[PDB]
Amino acid sequence: SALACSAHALNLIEKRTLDHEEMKALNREVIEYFKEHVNPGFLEYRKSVTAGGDYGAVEWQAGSLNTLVDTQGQEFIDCLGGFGIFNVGHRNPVVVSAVQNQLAKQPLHSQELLDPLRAMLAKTLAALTPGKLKYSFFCNSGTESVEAALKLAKAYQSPRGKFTFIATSGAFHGKSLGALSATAKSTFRKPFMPLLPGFRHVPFGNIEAMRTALNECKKTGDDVAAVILEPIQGEGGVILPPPGYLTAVRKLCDEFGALMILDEVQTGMGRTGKMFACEHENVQPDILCLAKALGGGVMPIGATIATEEVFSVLFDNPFLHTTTFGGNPLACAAALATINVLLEQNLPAQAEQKGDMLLDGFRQLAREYPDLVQEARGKGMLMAIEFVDNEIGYNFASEMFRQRVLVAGTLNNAKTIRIEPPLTLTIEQCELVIKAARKALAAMRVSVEQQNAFYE
Amino acid sequence: SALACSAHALNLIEKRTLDHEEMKALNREVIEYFKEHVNPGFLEYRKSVTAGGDYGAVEWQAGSLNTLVDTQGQEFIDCLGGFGIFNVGHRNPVVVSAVQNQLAKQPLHSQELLDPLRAMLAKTLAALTPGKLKYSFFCNSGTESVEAALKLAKAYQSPRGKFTFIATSGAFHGKSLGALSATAKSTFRKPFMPLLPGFRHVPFGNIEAMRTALNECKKTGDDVAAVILEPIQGEGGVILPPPGYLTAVRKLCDEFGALMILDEVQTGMGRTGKMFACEHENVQPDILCLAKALGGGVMPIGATIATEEVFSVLFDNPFLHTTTFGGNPLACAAALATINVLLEQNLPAQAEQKGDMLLDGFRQLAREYPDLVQEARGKGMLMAIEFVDNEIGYNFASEMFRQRVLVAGTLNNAKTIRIEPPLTLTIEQCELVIKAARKALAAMRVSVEQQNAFYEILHLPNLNEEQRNAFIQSLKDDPSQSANLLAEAKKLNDAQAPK
Amino acid sequence: SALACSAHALNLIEKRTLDHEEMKALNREVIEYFKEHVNPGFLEYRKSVTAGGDYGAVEWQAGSLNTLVDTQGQEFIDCLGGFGIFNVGHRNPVVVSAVQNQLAKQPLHSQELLDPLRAMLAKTLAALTPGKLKYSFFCNSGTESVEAALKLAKAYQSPRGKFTFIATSGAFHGKSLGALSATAKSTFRKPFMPLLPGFRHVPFGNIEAMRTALNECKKTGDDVAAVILEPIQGEGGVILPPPGYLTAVRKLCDEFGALMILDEVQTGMGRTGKMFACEHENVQPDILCLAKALGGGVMPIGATIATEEVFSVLFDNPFLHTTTFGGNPLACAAALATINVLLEQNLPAQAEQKGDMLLDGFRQLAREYPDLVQEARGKGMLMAIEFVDNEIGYNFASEMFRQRVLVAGTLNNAKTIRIEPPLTLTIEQCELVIKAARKALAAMRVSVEQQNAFYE
Amino acid sequence: SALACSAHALNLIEKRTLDHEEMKALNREVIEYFKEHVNPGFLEYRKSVTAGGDYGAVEWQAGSLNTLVDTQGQEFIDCLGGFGIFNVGHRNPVVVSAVQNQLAKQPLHSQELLDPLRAMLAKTLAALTPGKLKYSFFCNSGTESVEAALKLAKAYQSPRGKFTFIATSGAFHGKSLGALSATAKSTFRKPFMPLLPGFRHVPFGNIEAMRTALNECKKTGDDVAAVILEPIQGEGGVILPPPGYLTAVRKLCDEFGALMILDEVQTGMGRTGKMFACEHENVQPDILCLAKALGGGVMPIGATIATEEVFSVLFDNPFLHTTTFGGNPLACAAALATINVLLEQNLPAQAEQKGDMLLDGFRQLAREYPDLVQEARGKGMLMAIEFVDNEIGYNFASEMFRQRVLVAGTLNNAKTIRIEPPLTLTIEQCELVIKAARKALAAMRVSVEQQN
Ligand SMILES: Cc1ncc(COP(=O)(O)O)c(C=O)c1O
Ligand SMILES: Cc1ncc(COP(=O)(O)O)c(C=O)c1O
Ligand SMILES: Cc1ncc(COP(=O)(O)O)c(C=O)c1O
Ligand SMILES: Cc1ncc(COP(=O)(O)O)c(C=O)c1O
């Protein structure tokens, strides 16, 4: 019964330890329910199962700030970081304390009385963001933040006769249908077509191709409402644009009267060595999207911040764009604590130092193993290792997993492995990660050599 | 500085009490930051400000299961219920305990190791839902659940050559751009057009108009992929369809080979007197959307549940449709606790009993006040009172607010006032809500009767100015006697007619 | 060589007679060139080939006003009438004389000097059309006339925020991509999708379904710019709406602020017993489309006539909507002569009298042959016979062809056979057509009886 | 009454000459009916009215092959050529004779019996066109030919999952809503939006920008069904692409599996010095569009010619794409006669020779008048003179009109004046046109020097 299932799960939530028999029963039950009620594809394509040993690797609790402990007591150093969620580590005490304090008062707002933490977070974000960014709309995810940015741009530009949107190939802006029209990967989009009309893509980091697109749109009467881009493409493989590119896009948008939307869902909250990646060139977009790390690794949250000029489209009818849970007190408490931690501990400067050290180590391994590795790239703690092929990349991800270092990479998506550890990763843990990567590459080379000896 | 602002907010999060001077400083700061950084429109159109007195009504903490306490210590009975979020009350101890226990272990998942609570919640939801609904996709909101439903329908129907979607007028399915294409209100959609192509709308509760839309699409080669609808329209004003309508939509979808998507974001989790409103007629949709109360009034969560036939479009590439935070352990712990509370306390049966009692009371008040009230409607704890006009509805919402009974209604959207209390509302509190509604209606009638008496006594022809001024003076002095004073002035006017 | 091919065709154009050997060589050459350069499907699905005997039936010259003579000297009474083109017969002497006179002066306009016949035809059409219809735009076909109507409606309604168009199922408005968005037949539209957005269809002749569509569009913010419909559906099978329907659509369009577009490409120029079918109920559309018979059966022409209120969208920039050949002197001369013939000879009144007689004859045959015929329908000289099935309808079309009476119907589209003879068809020829139809039905019944007896 | 109006017009059609009083009455009536029933905008923006003197310039008859005579007896040398319709001159006797002969037999087809001239013209066009172009679909105009090309590309490419179309900025492909989606001018498109989805534009003559568009579409899952372009842009101002460009577009279409549609409605039928402009580089498109001069300056006609690979999408249901009047006997007779005239008289070679002579003359005038003329461009008899500004260009068009030489140019669209005379323009007339252009420029310089 649903009653029995819920009671069994509540008992598991209360438990902190599992002996060998309790672990075996739990892991088996979890794998069965993933197969019958979640998605059997997760069992086929995840290294927590393909390289998870006899019982599979099932989550249990956070170990220390930068580690996770599975149901078998295995401790993993976290270099996946939820793809940029865990900037301040796992269960950061300041974030956890803020969420616990707010939970004791009121976790969700009434939807009528003015809610103080929405006002405090909006004020704090206005102080933290560059130039004229002043108003914030709160939501629950990165894709919701991008939907709110596209809607602000539409409400501002439709009365001005502009409806077209330009995005870049390789871009990832979310999977809800509005955000998916800007998202560029063919496999994510094709089954869901037709998407929103008037979305066009140009190569990322190519200013002349962007100018051509905006100019051709102007000549044909399909004037561009907004350009949307990530400062550095995450899902696209940690693709850095040429220096000056973001400043050139800003000038182009000003020239054509298009709004500039910067998607900092992955680069935001200190990851690239500054609070926002737009700060490396001192660029101020018209609309800024945040999510992932803004919730401190404790709550889901998204935020869309804009100038008063753009945001004022929501003033006459404040119910035009809304969300039920967006800006709830628990999420705001987590975000306020995260901003406090990042600034008090100077974690963006730590991301620059640790990211330079890790990227130097990965680049040196790339030089030593050109038979396996193509290139290592990064800015701050947003890094990627590109392998010679998908099979090699998945073998590296699986080997690191067996060495208890968690990295990105699924069975058919592992040619480029993103490395995004918490900004709180210790210097000793940075050294352990490099040592593990070297051991994995050495083991992989031996396996390839032993396969070539058998065939010869 | 951002550091100083965050430290000041963390200090506020740590406080549990506020004296009069701390309340005044906090309320003033909150109003200023809403104006400068949130939306000055909230200050103009919300009754927490227009009927909030000298300092405004600012949130502070939950009082009891069914009440909220503002920064001034004023306690409100909650009949708004976050528009259907607070089904198990405010800070339900079982839900709060589950979230606290999970926070001590791991609040957000790794995105690699298998996460147990996602598997437990998916299993519990399969056991709770009707028929062949078996697989769940977790997300963070109602609009995300509807986006996932539209995407499941698209991935299944595009290889079968079907792309069109039918929704109903009055429908509300969310405000993200995919969901907004199904959402029907013109004011929510027009500034954002063009939306997705191939969305059409038919009147809600009209099966022949739905059949015509499906058939005309078939004839022109624009075959319908899916029909999406709420079992009862919430935002549309608590609109109940005719008996048998949901079963008739199910048969029509089967006949045309269209998928049926039932949006139970507002009706789900016991609100209408059953766990899901589709259980009143025993209808099984192909896809079911949940959110709002699924998070227990503690966490944001959404869920899209489908048959294995439909959901299997995601098996070959389980990364085709994903969400970063969706299905996180805190949200799953809150949902598992909510389902446990609803079943252990049989809150859906309580929603039927309390909803019947409240709706009987509102219907009796509608009979007594046809000058102000057009109709009272509802199913379980999903109710609405429709007033004669917007102004009257906002006066009722403001009067209930002054009596510390929180109801729906904003300055320009108050002709229909939704009443969606927690399913845990006590029988005593149900009686108090009815008494407050009667007091609000009686106060509103006094204001109207006085206004009509002032305009009639000024225009009575056969009365002298000494008499006219004395009646007008008595109306100002005693507004409760407005009906009696008008009858006395009318009798004297007829008696002093030209002989 | 192209030179040799063109010289051979010019020699054929000059020839008026063909002996048996010349006919055999010509028919064989025509069939071969249709297979190799036109479309081999015409040879498979046309009764001029499937019921064309040993040599096929190839066109040669017009016989009398209502007849055609093939390359073998076979004379056919024309009841197909080019689907409503030949209203004033084949080679009507008044139309032919006007075209010959204009050809001796200037057949095509300069595109600079003001062309007199465009001005004369626009004036004549304003006098002929009801109420406030005053301005004409000339083009070359029915589908071009519909494109011009949709463009007039778009230019008027887009500044008023209305973009949606309502058409009816069964409707046929042309096959160019704009007109095809209103055209309703699935097989004509599906390979060409996506078509224009915002086009929606309701059942023809159902006023409540049209009111629902307009009302739902208003509620959702997709307000209807225009409603387009035929007064009687031609391609849809001669579908007559209930009496009062066109007047009710006019009132509904006025109520919602939508424009009314009447497509009279098939019903126009006297075919239904009045000059325009909208005259039966005295309905004035905002825009009226004409083509087919407007060219007198001699020239291609189309015309889109609108009120000054709507047409004035073209006044500030008279080059906004144009055509290269539209309104040329030959086409205008043919149209002016056609209007003169229809009015001088009272051909709309003749269409009413002859149409009532032919439809009475067909309905009596339907009464006698319910084993083959389902129903006969019509208004004036726009008629149709619906058979029990496609096979039976094609057998009737083929039998009439063997009796030298030309009717509509192709191999896989013959359940409903349209009958649209010239309005000049003599009373003696009306009687011959009914006698030929009776002979065809009697022959068809015998064949069915002889087949049912063989299987028993 | 409509009966009285039609009788009055039939009387005018029968008249061959007009005296001074008949001309005055006719011109006044024509201007009034244009104002009240056609479009009053034509009276404001046309040089036949703004530079038409006391009575306006109203058409009456063709003078000789290369001249037009108005209602006042004024004879104009035609360098406008209907923007590329009058390739074989006005009332070419071979074309007129063919149309008259066919009118005596059957002007419009039955829509059932096989019509011989449709088969003869399709055969002649297959012999005339390059490589694998074999099947023809006949229609009535350039915009209809483009609609048929877009539909052939859609029916071939939709089962292959490709729906996007690439056209170039500056392109003109017609004004019906499907063709208008490819047509690039903002003023022609904006009032009619939303047009067909999935249409994009790249700069004309820029192969790398076209490759980027095709590649970005491939990466996002919006694969391109077809590329559509003119070999030389007409309405865009006689814009010649770089050498090798059409061959590079052909290779790029083959690489991405997109169809190549060449719109030769303006360049076709000998105008650029070859029968089709695609013959200069020997490029074979998948679909070729023709119209304008294909009707010999006597009939409206359009043709869409394609390979059997593409056209075969219409074989299973030959009624899928149709047009009532398309391929009618009068139009086919006119086209057969036009092809016969062009080949017998080698008019494409004459267009190359006369075009070189005219463009040399215009380029010499550009060198002498840089104060008024920016540049002269052309290929064969498709030419343009670009002026320093719109006002100067309209002054040139108006001055040439007063010297009885008809050129393109309207009040607000005259910065680039297209010169597209009949290919039959005599060598003497070429010299007279150059002399009139010099006189017009000299008179314009005097008027500017008056202000300065
Ligand atoms: C740049 C970017 N935009 C948007 C998103 C979507 O955010 P969410 O998964 O929270 O919907 C992501 C998530 O990976 C992202 O990296
Ligand atoms: C029926 C219905 N669907 C969808 C939604 C949207 O949910 P959310 O506000 O969480 O995006 C709501 C919320 O009001 C709803 O009532
Ligand atoms: C009602 C109607 N509209 C439009 C058209 C299309 O006209 P055309 O074939 O001349 O393009 C037709 C032709 O059959 C028609 O009957
Ligand atoms: C290149 C081109 N394509 C298409 C067209 C449209 O032809 P029509 O005006 O006959 O519709 C033209 C006419 O100017 C043209 O030059």
DSSP string for residues in B8-50? HHHHHHH-----HHHHHHHHHHHHHHIIIII-THHHHH-HHHH
Q: Which of D80, D168, D173 to mutate to test the pocket of ligand 4 (most atoms within 8 A of CB)?
A: D173
β-sheet bridge partners, residue B151: none
Residue nearest to atom 16 of ligand 4 (CA): D266
Instruction: Using alpha carbons, select from D3, D91, D365, D324 the residue that is nearest to residue C85.
Output: D324
How many other CB atoms are there within 10 angstroms of residue A17's CB atom? 9
Burial class (CB within 10 angstroms; exposed 0-12, middle 13-18, buried 19+) of A120: buried
Residues of chain A positioned with their CB less than 8 A from the CB of D184: 219-220
Q: Which of C3, C23, C38 to substitute to test the interface with D, most D CBs within 10 Å?
A: C38
- State the Cα–Cα distance between residues C313 and D34, nearest whole angstrom: 16
Evaluate: CB of B17 within 6 angstroms of ligand 1. Answer: no
CA C62 → CA C86, D36, D109, D113, distances in Å?
A: 12, 39, 10, 12
Cα A421 to the chain's mean position, in Å?
Answer: 12
Q: Residue A276: inside a domain, yes or no?
A: yes
Residues of chain C positioned with their CB less than 8 A from the CB of D179: 176-177
* Residue in the structure block whose two tokens are 């739990």: A26
Evaluate: CB of C230 within 6 angstroms of ligand 3. Answer: yes
Cβ(A79)–Cβ(A405) below 8 Å = yes
Taking the centre of ligand 3 as the mean of its atom positions, its distance from the CA of residue C235, in whole angstroms, is 9
B313 Cβ partners below 8 Å, 6+ apart?
A191, B152, B155, B156, B320
State the amino acid at position B137 in one-letter form. Answer: F
Q: Residue A198: inside a domain, yes or no?
A: yes
Q: Which atom of ligand 2 is nearest to the CA of B300?
A: 10
DSSP state for residue C284 in the 8-state scheme: -
Query: Which residue is closest to B199 within chain C, CA to CA?
Result: C198
Residues B309 and B429 in one domain: no
Please report how the helices A390-402 and A427-455 are oriented relative to each other, as an axis angle in degrees rounded to 10.
120
Residue nearest to atom 7 of ligand 4 (CA): D142
Residues C130 and C249 in one domain: yes
DSSP state for residue B114 in the 8-state scheme: B
Q: Which atom of ligand 4 is nearest to the CA of D142?
A: 7
Q: Which atom of ligand 2 is nearest to the CA of B264?
A: 1
Supply the CATH number for residue C371's domain. Answer: 3.90.1150.10
Cβ(B392)–Cβ(B444) below 8 Å = yes
A309 Cβ partners below 8 Å, 6+ apart?
A132, A286
- B305 φ, ψ to 5°? -110, 135
Q: Residue B198: inside a domain, yes or no?
A: yes
Q: Which helix (H) or strand (E) holds B213?
A: helix B207-220
B312 Cβ partners below 8 Å, 6+ apart?
none
* Contact state of D106 with C155 under an 8 Å Cβ cutoff: no
Taking the centre of ligand 2 as the mean of its atom positions, its distance from the CA of residue B299, in whole angstroms, is 15
Taking the centre of ligand 4 as the mean of its atom positions, its distance from the CA of residue C154, in whole angstroms, is 22
A398 Cβ partners below 8 Å, 6+ apart?
A47, A50, A51
**Which tokens go with D327?**
């391929």
How many other CB atoms are there within 10 angstroms of residue C319's CB atom? 16
Supply the CATH number for residue B491's domain. Answer: 1.20.5.420
Residues of chain D positioned with their CB less than 8 A from the CB of A184: 219-220
Q: Is A296 annotated as a binding residue?
A: no
Q: Residue D225: inside a domain, yes or no?
A: yes
This structure's resolution (Å) is 1.6
Instruction: Using alpha carbons, select from D81, D49, D151 the residue that is nearest to residue D381.
Output: D81
Residues of chain B positioned with their CB less than 8 A from the CB of A7: 340
Q: Is C74 annotated as a binding residue?
A: no
Q: Which helix (H) or strand (E) holds A352?
A: helix A347-368
Is the dihedral angle over the CA atoms D176, D177, D179, D182 positive or is it negative? positive
How many other CB atoms are there within 10 angstroms of residue C142's CB atom? 32
How many other CB atoms are there within 10 angstroms of residue D1's CB atom? 10
Residues C181 and C72 in one domain: no
Residues A361 and A316 in one domain: no
How many other CB atoms are there within 10 angstroms of residue B254's CB atom? 12
Q: Residue D118: inside a domain, yes or no?
A: yes
B347 Cβ partners below 8 Å, 6+ apart?
B87, B88, B270, B341, B423, B424
Q: Residue C5: inside a domain, yes or no?
A: no
CA A139 → CA A147, A261, A303, distances in Å?
A: 10, 17, 6
Q: Are strands B67-70 and B75-78 parallel, antiparallel or unpaired?
A: antiparallel
3-state class of C164 per DSSP?
Answer: strand
Residue nearest to atom 4 of ligand 2 (CA): B173
Residues A6 and A137 in one domain: no
Is the dihedral angle over the CA atoms C188, C190, C194, C198 positive or is it negative? positive
Residues of chain B positioned with their CB less than 8 A from the CB of C202: 212, 216
- State the Cα–Cα distance between residues A228 and A270, nearest whole angstrom: 21
Residues B350 and B340 in one domain: no
Distance to chain B for A244, nearest Cα, Å = 27
- State the Cα–Cα distance between residues D452 and D372, nearest whole angstrom: 14
- State the Cα–Cα distance between residues D380 and C159, nearest whole angstrom: 43
Residues D328 and D367 in one domain: no
| Of the residues D298, D321, D344, the one at which a domain ends | D344
Q: Which of D169, D197, D203 sits opposite A197 (nearest CB)?
A: D197
Query: Which residue is closest to D74 within chain C, CA to CA?
Result: C113
Taking the centre of ligand 2 as the mean of its atom positions, its distance from the CA of residue B266, in whole angstroms, is 7
Residues D110 and D190 in one domain: yes
3-state class of A327 per DSSP?
Answer: coil
Is the dihedral angle over the CA atoms C257, C281, C229, C125 positive or is it negative? negative
Residues B162 and B230 in one domain: yes
| Of the residues C309, C344, C379, the one at which a domain ends | C344
Q: Domain range holding D60? A: 54-84+347-451
In the A/D pair of chains, how many CB contacts fall below 8 A?
60
Residues of chain B positioned with their CB less than 8 A from the CB of A102: 13
* Contact state of D216 with A194 under an 8 Å Cβ cutoff: no
Q: Which chains touch A (3 or more CB pairs under 8 A)?
A: B, D
Distance to chain B for A454, nearest Cα, Å = 34
Taking the centre of ligand 2 as the mean of its atom positions, its distance from the CA of residue B148, in whole angstroms, is 13
Residues C17 and C107 in one domain: no
Q: Which helix (H) or strand (E) holds A78?
A: strand A75-78
* Contact state of B124 with A413 under an 8 Å Cβ cutoff: no
Q: Which of D2, D9, D26 sits opposite C128 (nearest CB)?
A: D2
- State the Cα–Cα distance between residues C42 and C35, nearest whole angstrom: 8
Supply the CATH number for residue C151's domain. Answer: 3.40.640.10
Cβ(A280)–Cβ(A247) below 8 Å = no
CA B429 → CA B79, B86, B293, B357, D30, distances in Å?
A: 10, 16, 21, 12, 85
* Contact state of C197 with B194 under an 8 Å Cβ cutoff: yes
| Of the residues B319, B344, B369, the one at which a domain ends | B344
Query: Which residue is closest to C343 within chain D, CA to CA?
Result: D3
Q: Residue B83: inside a domain, yes or no?
A: no
* Contact state of D184 with A209 under an 8 Å Cβ cutoff: no
Residues D124 and D80 in one domain: no
Residues D68 and D158 in one domain: no
* Contact state of B2 with A127 under an 8 Å Cβ cutoff: yes
Evaluate: CB of C141 within 6 angstroms of ligand 3. Answer: yes
- State the Cα–Cα distance between residues A86 and A421, nearest whole angstrom: 7
| Count of domains for chain C | 2
Q: Residue B82: inside a domain, yes or no?
A: no
* Contact state of C194 with B197 under an 8 Å Cβ cutoff: yes
* Contact state of D10 with C297 under an 8 Å Cβ cutoff: no
**Which tokens go with C185?**
């037949």
Residues of chain B positioned with their CB less than 8 A from the CB of C181: none
* Contact state of C85 with D12 under an 8 Å Cβ cutoff: no
Which of the ligands is closest to the CA of residue B168? 2
D338 Cβ partners below 8 Å, 6+ apart?
D87, D88, D92, D95, D269, D293, D294, D295, D296
**Which tokens go with A256?**
């054509």
Q: Which of C181, C220, C228 to substitute to test the interface with B, most B CBs within 10 Å?
A: C220
Q: Which of B175, B177, B292 to mutate to test the pocket of ligand 2 (most atoms within 8 A of CB)?
A: B292
